[PDB]
Structure formats: C-alpha cells, structure tokens
Amino acid sequence: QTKKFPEGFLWGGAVAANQVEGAYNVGGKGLSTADVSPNGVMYPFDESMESLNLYHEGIDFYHRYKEDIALFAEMGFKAFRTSIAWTRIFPNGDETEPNEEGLEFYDRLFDELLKYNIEPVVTISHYEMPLGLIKKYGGWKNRKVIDCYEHYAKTVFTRYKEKVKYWMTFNEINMVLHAPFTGGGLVFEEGENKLNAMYQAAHHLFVASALAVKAGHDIIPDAKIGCMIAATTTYPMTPKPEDVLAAMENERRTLFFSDVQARGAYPGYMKRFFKENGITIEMAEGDEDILKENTVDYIGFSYYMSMVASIDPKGIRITLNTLYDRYQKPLFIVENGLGAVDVVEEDGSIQDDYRINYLRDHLKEVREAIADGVDLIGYTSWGPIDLVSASTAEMKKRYGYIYVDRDNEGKGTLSRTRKKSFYWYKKVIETNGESL
C-alpha cells in the first residue's frame, strides 16, 4: 500500500480575512458582522465599540502578509485558503462601483502567493458581510442582497480571473440556522417567524451561490467553484433504530445544504420538515432552474470531531467516504486542525506534539479514504498561522504551525515563531505524505 498522496495534491492551510487581517478601518473598509461581534459569532453582537474586539487588529496580516506568506512557502504550501473581505470591496454592500483600495490589496495578496507558486483558494463570503446590508435591507432574507452578492462576486471574478482558479461561494451556509446574525445578517423583530426568516435567507443564499457558479464559470473558464459545508458526522449511541434515525437526521442537517448545492434541488425529506413545522419559503419562478443548472464543481468541507445521538481521526475517513458515495464529486478538506493552549519555552520554542498527533492521525486516515477511491483535491488545515477564533474571538485557542505573540487581551509583540509542527508539516508536504 502506497504511503504517498496523489500527485498534485493541494497541501496548505486556511484562514478567514476577519480572523487575521486586522486593519478593519483601513482603505475605506466598511463595518462587518465580525467588527460588531467582539466576543465571537457564538455570542451576541455589540455595536457600542466599548469592548476590545480582537478582530479589529487580528494578527495584522494586512501589513504582515509578505512575511507570513513567506512562512507558508517555507513549509512548501501548494495552496492557501483565505476569504476576500466583502466590506473591503463594498463597504456598505450596495455600492455600484467597488472600492479600488480593497481590490488592490488582494491583488498584492494573490500576487504574493503566486510568487511562491501557491494556489489561492478564495472564499467569497466568510462570516463578514457588510453591516450596511443588515441595517438597510434586513440581511439575507431580502432578495436585494442576492443582487449585491452577485455584483460582488462578478467584481472579484473579473478582477482576479488570471490569479485565482479555486473559489468557494459561502463558508458553511448552515451557519444561518445557528448564528443568524453572522450566517445571514438576521435579527428577529416582534412577531417575526424565526424559522421562516432563517430558511428564507438560506434559500437566497442558495440562489446567490448558484448565480456565483454561473458567473464564475462565465468569467473564468477554467475555474472550479465549490461549496462549503461543516461535516456533521454523527454515530448512533445505541443500535436502537430510533437512535439510528436520530444520527441520520442530524447528518441531514448539513447534507441538505450540500444536496441543494451539489445535486441542484431541495431534497424530498425537506418537504416534510417544512410541512411538519410552520416553515413556508417564498420562492421565485426560475429559482429551481438556477439551482439545478449551476451545481458546484467540488464539495469543500471542514471536519474537527465526531458526534453521537441518543478527537476522532477515523471519522474523517468515514466523512470522506460518506460524502463521495452520496455525491460522486471531487472533495476538498478546507478546515481541519486542533485548537489548544501553547506554551512558549525558555528558549522561545513551542513543542506542540499534541497538535502534531492530531494532524498526523487525521492525515493517515485521509490517505486511507484516498485508498478507498475518494476523489480529494487537497487538504488545507485551519489557521496555519495563529488567528482570532471565530466562536469566541480569542487567541488562546491556537491552531497554527506558526505562533503569534498576541493574547486574549490584545497584548503582545505580534512576532511569528515556528512551532515544532511547522517543521513536521514541512516534511509532510515535502514527502507528499510519506513521512506520516
């Protein structure tokens, strides 16, 4: 049995703009949902600007990108995933002409990656929609936001047609059902049906993402535009059929989104979920054909852990087989890693064997799924450089191969230090997985 990955396997790492860039008020950039969520997406927003918001400065990737990308190339990154800040291109979100200072920055960022022959993997919207679209239109429950996103998608497609070939429309559309403010820009007014508004926004997100696939293929002929779901691999606690159906239903909570994005239609099991609840979804004629004629090219997904219904490296092999068996389309692991507390030794090093073990075991199981015949484009671990966490807007939960001197209260020199996992991953990419 081979120990090497497929040739051309896209090794690398993944971040999001609002989690590393900083410079939140530079170059005319508008306020995003992250800019008013100083305690993470999992906690209520706050527009007072009275508390410390680590997203405002991040790790200053906006100013330190040349050194950080040089560190990604030192590990031999074949690909690098990040997001284009929607607010940098459209501060309020509904402008007719884009912001030239925002587009020029991503010219410099994408040029820097291509200096080291690193493939950019660009998420178009990643938990950072303009706050102006929330106050003006009410978020993704308004059909006008589709036009703003399509305009935004078309703008970045034409601007980077020669530089970016791998795109993802939305990062985890399902987030609209768990954090409606970040997922779809929603707040529930008096008497407003909550489930209706969320699934109404999910439909607009579905249609807007399909329009971006159509626009992306038209503007960039060789582009591969993919979806992004957070894998919810769930095992039944007991062999009782009620728990087997429970695990199946929890897995369907995410497969519904990849069903619409990859297969092109609302699956049948959603007709009764909408009926047995009070959920009615206003739908325009021709939306069904837009969803079906512009399915995504690949299925990007994240994986961190298994779940039960009543740390797991083998579960990522189950997830890869389950997704590929259902859709028969190329997959892409776009987020995976271990968040943990780092300790800087007296000599300045970081001995993160705990993070090496997680990544090594999960990649050994990824190689097994490839041996099972799964079509996998690449693997970008989450936050190759320490970033501000999405859930709580913190630094203590570190994912990186590179340590950033910044703590939860914003203190620190912001210097970068190679962890022990930095050199371990450098050898993994060098041997194409043979050193695992």
GROMACS .gro file of C-alpha atoms in nm:
model
  436
    1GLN     CA    1   0.000   0.000   0.000
    2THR     CA    2   0.133   0.341  -0.102
    3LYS     CA    3   0.246   0.593   0.159
    4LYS     CA    4   0.236   0.894  -0.076
    5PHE     CA    5  -0.064   1.108  -0.167
    6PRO     CA    6  -0.183   1.168  -0.525
    7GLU     CA    7   0.049   1.382  -0.734
    8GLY     CA    8  -0.059   1.745  -0.744
    9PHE     CA    9  -0.233   1.712  -0.407
   10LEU     CA   10  -0.303   2.065  -0.284
   11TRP     CA   11  -0.134   2.080   0.055
   12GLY     CA   12  -0.173   2.401   0.252
   13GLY     CA   13  -0.367   2.591   0.515
   14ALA     CA   14  -0.679   2.801   0.553
   15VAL     CA   15  -0.774   3.127   0.726
   16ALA     CA   16  -1.051   3.385   0.702
   17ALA     CA   17  -0.998   3.756   0.639
   18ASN     CA   18  -1.171   3.886   0.952
   19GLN     CA   19  -0.966   3.644   1.166
   20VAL     CA   20  -0.611   3.750   1.068
   21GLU     CA   21  -0.614   4.066   0.856
   22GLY     CA   22  -0.685   4.336   1.107
   23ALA     CA   23  -0.679   4.686   0.957
   24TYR     CA   24  -1.057   4.681   0.992
   25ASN     CA   25  -1.089   5.057   0.926
   26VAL     CA   26  -0.815   5.096   0.663
   27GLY     CA   27  -0.864   5.185   0.298
   28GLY     CA   28  -1.231   5.270   0.335
   29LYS     CA   29  -1.330   4.921   0.451
   30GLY     CA   30  -1.680   4.914   0.597
   31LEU     CA   31  -1.802   4.752   0.916
   32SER     CA   32  -1.876   4.379   0.901
   33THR     CA   33  -2.062   4.149   1.137
   34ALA     CA   34  -1.728   4.049   1.290
   35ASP     CA   35  -1.647   4.416   1.356
   36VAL     CA   36  -1.950   4.433   1.590
   37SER     CA   37  -1.912   4.088   1.748
   38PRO     CA   38  -1.629   4.142   2.000
   39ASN     CA   39  -1.698   3.806   2.171
   40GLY     CA   40  -1.724   3.581   1.864
   41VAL     CA   41  -2.002   3.466   1.635
   42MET     CA   42  -2.136   3.235   1.910
   43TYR     CA   43  -2.216   3.537   2.130
   44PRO     CA   44  -2.445   3.840   2.085
   45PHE     CA   45  -2.328   4.127   1.869
   46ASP     CA   46  -2.241   4.467   2.014
   47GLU     CA   47  -2.235   4.796   1.821
   48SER     CA   48  -2.116   5.012   2.113
   49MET     CA   49  -1.745   4.964   2.029
   50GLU     CA   50  -1.683   4.986   2.404
   51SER     CA   51  -1.524   4.641   2.445
   52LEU     CA   52  -1.198   4.513   2.300
   53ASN     CA   53  -1.259   4.343   1.964
   54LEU     CA   54  -0.962   4.129   1.861
   55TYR     CA   55  -1.097   4.114   1.504
   56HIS     CA   56  -1.022   4.486   1.466
   57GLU     CA   57  -0.646   4.419   1.468
   58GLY     CA   58  -0.633   4.041   1.421
   59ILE     CA   59  -0.270   3.945   1.371
   60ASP     CA   60  -0.212   4.240   1.133
   61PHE     CA   61  -0.193   4.006   0.833
   62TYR     CA   62  -0.293   4.310   0.625
   63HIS     CA   63   0.051   4.461   0.695
   64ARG     CA   64   0.250   4.141   0.763
   65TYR     CA   65   0.131   3.930   0.468
   66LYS     CA   66   0.471   3.929   0.297
   67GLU     CA   67   0.642   3.769   0.598
   68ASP     CA   68   0.355   3.530   0.671
   69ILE     CA   69   0.321   3.404   0.313
   70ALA     CA   70   0.699   3.353   0.309
   71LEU     CA   71   0.646   3.125   0.609
   72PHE     CA   72   0.373   2.935   0.423
   73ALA     CA   73   0.614   2.888   0.132
   74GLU     CA   74   0.886   2.772   0.373
   75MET     CA   75   0.658   2.482   0.464
   76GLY     CA   76   0.602   2.427   0.092
   77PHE     CA   77   0.233   2.521   0.079
   78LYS     CA   78   0.082   2.409  -0.251
   79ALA     CA   79  -0.237   2.607  -0.178
   80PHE     CA   80  -0.359   2.872   0.064
   81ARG     CA   81  -0.722   2.938   0.153
   82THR     CA   82  -0.850   3.276   0.269
   83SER     CA   83  -1.153   3.497   0.213
   84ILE     CA   84  -1.194   3.828   0.034
   85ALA     CA   85  -1.335   4.076   0.284
   86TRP     CA   86  -1.672   4.177   0.139
   87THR     CA   87  -1.651   4.509   0.326
   88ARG     CA   88  -1.317   4.595   0.162
   89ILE     CA   89  -1.474   4.578  -0.186
   90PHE     CA   90  -1.817   4.717  -0.088
   91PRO     CA   91  -1.813   4.899   0.248
   92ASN     CA   92  -2.191   4.940   0.277
   93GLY     CA   93  -2.260   4.645   0.044
   94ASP     CA   94  -2.485   4.811  -0.216
   95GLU     CA   95  -2.243   5.046  -0.394
   96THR     CA   96  -2.239   5.035  -0.773
   97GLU     CA   97  -1.864   5.084  -0.811
   98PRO     CA   98  -1.625   4.878  -0.595
   99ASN     CA   99  -1.354   5.012  -0.367
  100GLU     CA  100  -1.024   5.033  -0.555
  101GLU     CA  101  -0.818   5.028  -0.234
  102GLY     CA  102  -0.978   4.699  -0.131
  103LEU     CA  103  -0.930   4.526  -0.466
  104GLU     CA  104  -0.569   4.644  -0.484
  105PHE     CA  105  -0.483   4.477  -0.152
  106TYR     CA  106  -0.599   4.136  -0.273
  107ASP     CA  107  -0.404   4.199  -0.593
  108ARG     CA  108  -0.096   4.226  -0.370
  109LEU     CA  109  -0.201   3.928  -0.156
  110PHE     CA  110  -0.273   3.699  -0.451
  111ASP     CA  111   0.044   3.816  -0.628
  112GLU     CA  112   0.245   3.729  -0.317
  113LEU     CA  113   0.105   3.375  -0.311
  114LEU     CA  114   0.174   3.328  -0.683
  115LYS     CA  115   0.533   3.442  -0.625
  116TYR     CA  116   0.581   3.110  -0.442
  117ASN     CA  117   0.354   2.914  -0.681
  118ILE     CA  118   0.085   2.886  -0.412
  119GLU     CA  119  -0.265   2.831  -0.547
  120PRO     CA  120  -0.514   3.077  -0.395
  121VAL     CA  121  -0.835   2.919  -0.264
  122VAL     CA  122  -1.074   3.211  -0.218
  123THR     CA  123  -1.393   3.203  -0.011
  124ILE     CA  124  -1.611   3.484  -0.143
  125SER     CA  125  -1.817   3.535   0.176
  126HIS     CA  126  -1.684   3.402   0.510
  127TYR     CA  127  -1.880   3.537   0.809
  128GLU     CA  128  -1.809   3.903   0.728
  129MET     CA  129  -2.097   4.052   0.532
  130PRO     CA  130  -2.135   4.433   0.531
  131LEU     CA  131  -2.330   4.566   0.827
  132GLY     CA  132  -2.489   4.822   0.594
  133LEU     CA  133  -2.682   4.546   0.419
  134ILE     CA  134  -2.823   4.437   0.756
  135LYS     CA  135  -2.947   4.783   0.857
  136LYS     CA  136  -3.062   4.886   0.509
  137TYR     CA  137  -3.223   4.570   0.370
  138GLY     CA  138  -3.263   4.339   0.670
  139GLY     CA  139  -3.000   4.085   0.570
  140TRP     CA  140  -3.020   3.778   0.351
  141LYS     CA  141  -3.397   3.749   0.397
  142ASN     CA  142  -3.416   4.028   0.135
  143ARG     CA  143  -3.381   3.934  -0.231
  144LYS     CA  144  -3.185   4.254  -0.297
  145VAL     CA  145  -2.884   4.111  -0.110
  146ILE     CA  146  -2.863   3.848  -0.385
  147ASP     CA  147  -2.805   4.127  -0.637
  148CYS     CA  148  -2.539   4.280  -0.410
  149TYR     CA  149  -2.359   3.947  -0.369
  150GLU     CA  150  -2.382   3.866  -0.741
  151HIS     CA  151  -2.239   4.211  -0.817
  152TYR     CA  152  -1.971   4.147  -0.554
  153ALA     CA  153  -1.894   3.801  -0.692
  154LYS     CA  154  -1.878   3.925  -1.052
  155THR     CA  155  -1.642   4.205  -0.943
  156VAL     CA  156  -1.384   3.977  -0.781
  157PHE     CA  157  -1.420   3.715  -1.057
  158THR     CA  158  -1.320   3.964  -1.327
  159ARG     CA  159  -1.055   4.131  -1.111
  160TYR     CA  160  -0.873   3.805  -1.030
  161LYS     CA  161  -0.955   3.595  -1.337
  162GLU     CA  162  -0.582   3.538  -1.401
  163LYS     CA  163  -0.482   3.464  -1.041
  164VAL     CA  164  -0.748   3.259  -0.859
  165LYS     CA  165  -0.884   2.934  -1.003
  166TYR     CA  166  -1.034   2.777  -0.687
  167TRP     CA  167  -1.334   2.958  -0.537
  168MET     CA  168  -1.595   2.884  -0.273
  169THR     CA  169  -1.915   3.088  -0.264
  170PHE     CA  170  -2.016   3.079   0.104
  171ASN     CA  171  -1.845   2.935   0.411
  172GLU     CA  172  -2.097   2.700   0.574
  173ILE     CA  173  -2.440   2.829   0.469
  174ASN     CA  174  -2.587   2.625   0.757
  175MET     CA  175  -2.447   2.889   0.997
  176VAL     CA  176  -2.763   3.091   0.923
  177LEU     CA  177  -2.955   2.834   1.132
  178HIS     CA  178  -2.721   2.851   1.434
  179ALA     CA  179  -2.594   3.213   1.437
  180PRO     CA  180  -2.847   3.405   1.226
  181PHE     CA  181  -2.671   3.740   1.271
  182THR     CA  182  -2.343   3.615   1.123
  183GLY     CA  183  -2.488   3.346   0.897
  184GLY     CA  184  -2.741   3.560   0.714
  185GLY     CA  185  -2.741   3.904   0.875
  186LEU     CA  186  -3.072   3.849   1.055
  187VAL     CA  187  -3.235   3.993   1.365
  188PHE     CA  188  -3.582   3.876   1.466
  189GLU     CA  189  -3.827   4.163   1.519
  190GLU     CA  190  -4.153   4.141   1.713
  191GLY     CA  191  -4.383   3.870   1.580
  192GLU     CA  192  -4.137   3.767   1.308
  193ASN     CA  193  -4.136   3.393   1.240
  194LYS     CA  194  -3.781   3.284   1.318
  195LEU     CA  195  -3.763   2.954   1.128
  196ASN     CA  196  -3.927   3.115   0.824
  197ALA     CA  197  -3.679   3.404   0.808
  198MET     CA  198  -3.376   3.177   0.851
  199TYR     CA  199  -3.478   2.928   0.581
  200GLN     CA  200  -3.589   3.219   0.362
  201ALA     CA  201  -3.236   3.359   0.395
  202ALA     CA  202  -3.091   3.013   0.331
  203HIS     CA  203  -3.283   2.999   0.002
  204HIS     CA  204  -3.149   3.338  -0.105
  205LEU     CA  205  -2.802   3.213  -0.011
  206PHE     CA  206  -2.867   2.904  -0.224
  207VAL     CA  207  -2.976   3.114  -0.523
  208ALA     CA  208  -2.694   3.367  -0.482
  209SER     CA  209  -2.437   3.086  -0.462
  210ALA     CA  210  -2.575   2.927  -0.779
  211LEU     CA  211  -2.557   3.263  -0.957
  212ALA     CA  212  -2.192   3.291  -0.850
  213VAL     CA  213  -2.120   2.948  -1.001
  214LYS     CA  214  -2.279   3.069  -1.325
  215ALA     CA  215  -2.089   3.399  -1.315
  216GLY     CA  216  -1.764   3.229  -1.213
  217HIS     CA  217  -1.773   2.979  -1.499
  218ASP     CA  218  -1.862   3.254  -1.747
  219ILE     CA  219  -1.586   3.491  -1.635
  220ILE     CA  220  -1.314   3.236  -1.552
  221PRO     CA  221  -1.350   2.937  -1.789
  222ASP     CA  222  -1.106   2.706  -1.606
  223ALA     CA  223  -1.231   2.798  -1.258
  224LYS     CA  224  -1.357   2.538  -1.012
  225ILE     CA  225  -1.625   2.690  -0.786
  226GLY     CA  226  -1.715   2.469  -0.492
  227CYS     CA  227  -1.946   2.459  -0.192
  228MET     CA  228  -1.854   2.463   0.176
  229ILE     CA  229  -2.032   2.266   0.448
  230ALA     CA  230  -1.932   2.179   0.804
  231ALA     CA  231  -1.936   1.799   0.819
  232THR     CA  232  -2.165   1.674   1.095
  233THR     CA  233  -2.063   1.308   1.109
  234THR     CA  234  -2.287   1.154   1.375
  235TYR     CA  235  -2.289   0.800   1.515
  236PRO     CA  236  -2.586   0.637   1.691
  237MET     CA  237  -2.521   0.594   2.062
  238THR     CA  238  -2.712   0.263   2.063
  239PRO     CA  239  -2.817   0.018   1.790
  240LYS     CA  240  -3.176   0.117   1.867
  241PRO     CA  241  -3.344   0.217   1.538
  242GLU     CA  242  -3.467   0.542   1.696
  243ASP     CA  243  -3.104   0.645   1.753
  244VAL     CA  244  -3.002   0.533   1.404
  245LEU     CA  245  -3.274   0.758   1.264
  246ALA     CA  246  -3.157   1.033   1.500
  247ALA     CA  247  -2.799   1.014   1.373
  248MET     CA  248  -2.931   1.011   1.016
  249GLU     CA  249  -3.143   1.320   1.084
  250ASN     CA  250  -2.854   1.512   1.241
  251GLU     CA  251  -2.632   1.430   0.943
  252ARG     CA  252  -2.912   1.553   0.714
  253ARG     CA  253  -2.895   1.891   0.889
  254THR     CA  254  -2.583   1.959   0.680
  255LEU     CA  255  -2.637   1.725   0.384
  256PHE     CA  256  -2.947   1.930   0.297
  257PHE     CA  257  -2.720   2.222   0.206
  258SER     CA  258  -2.475   2.012   0.006
  259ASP     CA  259  -2.776   1.840  -0.153
  260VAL     CA  260  -2.901   2.173  -0.288
  261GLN     CA  261  -2.554   2.299  -0.381
  262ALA     CA  262  -2.415   1.980  -0.538
  263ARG     CA  263  -2.727   1.798  -0.665
  264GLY     CA  264  -2.926   2.109  -0.757
  265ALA     CA  265  -3.262   2.077  -0.580
  266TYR     CA  266  -3.433   2.071  -0.244
  267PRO     CA  267  -3.431   1.704  -0.135
  268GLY     CA  268  -3.756   1.525  -0.067
  269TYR     CA  269  -3.701   1.482   0.307
  270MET     CA  270  -3.711   1.863   0.338
  271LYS     CA  271  -4.067   1.884   0.204
  272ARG     CA  272  -4.200   1.716   0.518
  273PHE     CA  273  -3.963   1.900   0.753
  274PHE     CA  274  -4.106   2.223   0.610
  275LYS     CA  275  -4.460   2.086   0.643
  276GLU     CA  276  -4.434   1.942   0.994
  277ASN     CA  277  -4.302   2.282   1.104
  278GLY     CA  278  -4.461   2.617   1.024
  279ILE     CA  279  -4.197   2.686   0.760
  280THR     CA  280  -4.312   2.843   0.433
  281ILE     CA  281  -4.048   2.972   0.191
  282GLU     CA  282  -4.126   3.238  -0.069
  283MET     CA  283  -3.968   3.120  -0.394
  284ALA     CA  284  -3.936   3.294  -0.730
  285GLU     CA  285  -4.005   3.121  -1.059
  286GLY     CA  286  -3.681   3.019  -1.227
  287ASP     CA  287  -3.502   2.978  -0.893
  288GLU     CA  288  -3.534   2.600  -0.927
  289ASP     CA  289  -3.359   2.601  -1.265
  290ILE     CA  290  -3.085   2.834  -1.137
  291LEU     CA  291  -3.022   2.590  -0.851
  292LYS     CA  292  -3.016   2.286  -1.082
  293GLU     CA  293  -2.823   2.423  -1.382
  294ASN     CA  294  -2.535   2.568  -1.175
  295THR     CA  295  -2.431   2.297  -0.932
  296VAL     CA  296  -2.090   2.342  -0.771
  297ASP     CA  297  -1.777   2.177  -0.908
  298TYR     CA  298  -1.647   2.035  -0.579
  299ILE     CA  299  -1.751   1.993  -0.216
  300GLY     CA  300  -1.526   2.175   0.027
  301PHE     CA  301  -1.588   2.077   0.387
  302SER     CA  302  -1.450   2.103   0.738
  303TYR     CA  303  -1.400   1.831   0.998
  304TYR     CA  304  -1.292   1.852   1.361
  305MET     CA  305  -1.469   1.577   1.555
  306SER     CA  306  -1.740   1.313   1.551
  307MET     CA  307  -2.074   1.336   1.733
  308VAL     CA  308  -2.322   1.098   1.894
  309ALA     CA  309  -2.702   1.090   1.904
  310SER     CA  310  -2.911   0.929   2.177
  311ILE     CA  311  -1.082   1.370   1.869
  312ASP     CA  312  -1.156   1.105   1.605
  313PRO     CA  313  -0.917   1.065   1.310
  314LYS     CA  314  -1.102   0.762   1.169
  315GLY     CA  315  -1.415   0.978   1.148
  316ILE     CA  316  -1.262   1.189   0.872
  317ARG     CA  317  -1.231   0.869   0.668
  318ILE     CA  318  -1.599   0.797   0.733
  319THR     CA  319  -1.688   1.153   0.631
  320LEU     CA  320  -1.486   1.139   0.308
  321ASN     CA  321  -1.647   0.808   0.205
  322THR     CA  322  -1.997   0.921   0.307
  323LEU     CA  323  -1.974   1.245   0.108
  324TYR     CA  324  -1.817   1.087  -0.200
  325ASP     CA  325  -2.058   0.792  -0.203
  326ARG     CA  326  -2.354   1.031  -0.198
  327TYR     CA  327  -2.238   1.298  -0.444
  328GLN     CA  328  -1.965   1.132  -0.657
  329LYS     CA  329  -1.790   1.468  -0.689
  330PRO     CA  330  -1.438   1.590  -0.603
  331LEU     CA  331  -1.397   1.678  -0.236
  332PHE     CA  332  -1.172   1.930  -0.062
  333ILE     CA  333  -1.084   1.934   0.308
  334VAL     CA  334  -1.073   2.310   0.368
  335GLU     CA  335  -1.066   2.317   0.751
  336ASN     CA  336  -0.914   2.069   0.996
  337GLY     CA  337  -0.691   2.106   1.299
  338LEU     CA  338  -0.650   2.105   1.675
  339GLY     CA  339  -0.703   2.419   1.881
  340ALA     CA  340  -0.507   2.405   2.204
  341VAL     CA  341  -0.309   2.614   2.451
  342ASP     CA  342   0.053   2.678   2.355
  343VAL     CA  343   0.339   2.735   2.599
  344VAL     CA  344   0.646   2.930   2.487
  345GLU     CA  345   0.954   2.762   2.633
  346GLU     CA  346   1.253   2.942   2.783
  347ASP     CA  347   1.442   2.910   2.453
  348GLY     CA  348   1.148   3.060   2.262
  349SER     CA  349   1.027   2.735   2.105
  350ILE     CA  350   0.680   2.579   2.106
  351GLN     CA  351   0.673   2.200   2.150
  352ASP     CA  352   0.325   2.122   2.018
  353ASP     CA  353   0.341   1.745   1.991
  354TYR     CA  354  -0.030   1.742   2.083
  355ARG     CA  355  -0.109   1.923   1.757
  356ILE     CA  356   0.127   1.701   1.556
  357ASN     CA  357  -0.053   1.389   1.681
  358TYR     CA  358  -0.396   1.521   1.579
  359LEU     CA  359  -0.280   1.621   1.230
  360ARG     CA  360  -0.075   1.305   1.170
  361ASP     CA  361  -0.353   1.064   1.271
  362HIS     CA  362  -0.617   1.252   1.072
  363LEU     CA  363  -0.393   1.258   0.764
  364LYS     CA  364  -0.318   0.886   0.796
  365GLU     CA  365  -0.695   0.835   0.781
  366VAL     CA  366  -0.724   1.078   0.489
  367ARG     CA  367  -0.477   0.861   0.297
  368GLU     CA  368  -0.698   0.560   0.369
  369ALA     CA  369  -1.004   0.731   0.219
  370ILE     CA  370  -0.797   0.813  -0.089
  371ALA     CA  371  -0.708   0.443  -0.100
  372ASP     CA  372  -1.084   0.381  -0.081
  373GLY     CA  373  -1.104   0.571  -0.411
  374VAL     CA  374  -1.229   0.905  -0.277
  375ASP     CA  375  -1.152   1.193  -0.515
  376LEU     CA  376  -0.981   1.452  -0.294
  377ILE     CA  377  -0.840   1.774  -0.439
  378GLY     CA  378  -0.631   1.878  -0.141
  379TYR     CA  379  -0.609   1.949   0.230
  380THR     CA  380  -0.576   2.291   0.396
  381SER     CA  381  -0.557   2.275   0.774
  382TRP     CA  382  -0.741   2.551   0.959
  383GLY     CA  383  -0.534   2.850   1.065
  384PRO     CA  384  -0.178   2.757   0.971
  385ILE     CA  385  -0.087   3.081   1.150
  386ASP     CA  386  -0.243   3.164   1.486
  387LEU     CA  387  -0.565   3.361   1.434
  388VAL     CA  388  -0.858   3.509   1.624
  389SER     CA  389  -1.108   3.230   1.684
  390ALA     CA  390  -1.446   3.251   1.513
  391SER     CA  391  -1.653   3.119   1.804
  392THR     CA  392  -1.529   3.345   2.085
  393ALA     CA  393  -1.291   3.598   1.919
  394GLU     CA  394  -0.992   3.473   2.119
  395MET     CA  395  -0.625   3.393   2.065
  396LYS     CA  396  -0.572   3.134   2.340
  397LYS     CA  397  -0.721   2.852   2.130
  398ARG     CA  398  -0.432   2.823   1.884
  399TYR     CA  399  -0.438   2.622   1.560
  400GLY     CA  400  -0.125   2.743   1.387
  401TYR     CA  401   0.200   2.593   1.278
  402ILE     CA  402   0.321   2.950   1.341
  403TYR     CA  403   0.287   3.113   1.683
  404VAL     CA  404   0.171   3.475   1.706
  405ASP     CA  405   0.259   3.674   2.019
  406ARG     CA  406  -0.088   3.806   2.097
  407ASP     CA  407  -0.313   3.705   2.386
  408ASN     CA  408  -0.684   3.738   2.465
  409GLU     CA  409  -0.644   4.099   2.588
  410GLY     CA  410  -0.464   4.206   2.270
  411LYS     CA  411  -0.120   4.229   2.434
  412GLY     CA  412   0.194   4.103   2.263
  413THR     CA  413   0.465   4.183   2.010
  414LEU     CA  414   0.280   4.013   1.718
  415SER     CA  415   0.604   3.837   1.620
  416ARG     CA  416   0.585   3.499   1.447
  417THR     CA  417   0.764   3.188   1.574
  418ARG     CA  418   0.788   2.850   1.403
  419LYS     CA  419   0.636   2.581   1.623
  420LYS     CA  420   0.753   2.220   1.617
  421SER     CA  421   0.452   2.138   1.398
  422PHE     CA  422   0.585   2.390   1.144
  423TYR     CA  423   0.881   2.166   1.062
  424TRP     CA  424   0.673   1.847   1.083
  425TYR     CA  425   0.425   1.978   0.825
  426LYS     CA  426   0.715   2.097   0.609
  427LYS     CA  427   0.834   1.736   0.588
  428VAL     CA  428   0.481   1.605   0.524
  429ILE     CA  429   0.438   1.828   0.218
  430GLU     CA  430   0.798   1.762   0.112
  431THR     CA  431   0.746   1.384   0.104
  432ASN     CA  432   0.383   1.417  -0.016
  433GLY     CA  433   0.264   1.242   0.299
  434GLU     CA  434   0.526   0.965   0.304
  435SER     CA  435   0.674   1.087   0.635
  436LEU     CA  436   0.343   1.050   0.824
   0.00000   0.00000   0.00000
